[PDB]
């Protein structure tokens, strides 16, 4: 129900994720937490992270705010390039501080 291009949600979510490219930093954190190959998905795993909290967080981060150059901009965005292996607490704290 989320279209990343327009960053607009349709209605009630009821779960059922979808494989689409998005800049929503909340779901970047969700991928970081629950990916089995490279992330923290082997430990932890799904049903341990509140997905609805991240849903509301992503909706908040997608709101339009003054750009400062006369336009508008989403509130908070990704575009990180993590190259150095830091502790999972460090990356989680950076995501939860952004």
Partner 1 sequence: MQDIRQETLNECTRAEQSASVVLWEIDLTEVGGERYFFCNEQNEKGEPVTWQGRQYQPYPIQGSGFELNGKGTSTRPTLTVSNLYGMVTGMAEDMQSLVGGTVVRRKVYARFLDAVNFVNGNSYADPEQEVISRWRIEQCSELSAVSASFVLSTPTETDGAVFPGRIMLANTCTWTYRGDECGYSGPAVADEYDQPTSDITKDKCSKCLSGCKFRNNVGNFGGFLSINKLSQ
Partner 2 sequence: RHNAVEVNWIDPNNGWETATELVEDTQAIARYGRNVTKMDAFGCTSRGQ
Partner 3 sequence: MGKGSSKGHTPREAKDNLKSTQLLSVIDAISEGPIEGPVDGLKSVLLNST
Chain residues in the site for partner 3 (CB under 8 A)? 19, 21, 35, 37-38
- Note the residues at the interface with partner 2 (CB under 8 A): 25, 28, 42-43, 65-69, 73, 75-80, 94-95, 97-98
CB 63 within 8 A of CB 54: no
CB atoms within 10 A of CB 61: 20
Q: Which of 25, 26, 28, 40 binds partner 1 (CB under 8 A)?
A: 40
* Residue 47: both structure tokens together: 């049903």
The residues binding partner 1 (CB under 8 A) are 32, 37-40, 43-44, 48-49, 82, 85-89, 91-92
């Amino acid at each position: 129900n989320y279209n990343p291009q327009t960053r607009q949600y349709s209605g009630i979510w009821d779960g059922t994720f979808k494989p689409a490219y998005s800049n929503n930093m909340a779901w970047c954190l969700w991928d970081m937490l629950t990916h089995p190959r490279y992330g923290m998905g082997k430990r932890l795993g799904a049903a341990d992270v509140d997905k609805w909290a991240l849903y509301v967080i992503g909706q908040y981060c997608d709101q339009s705010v003054p750009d400062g150059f006369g336009g508008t901009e989403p509130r908070i965005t990704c575009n990180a390039y993590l190259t150095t292996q830091r502790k999972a607490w460090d990356v989680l704290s950076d995501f939860c501080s952004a």
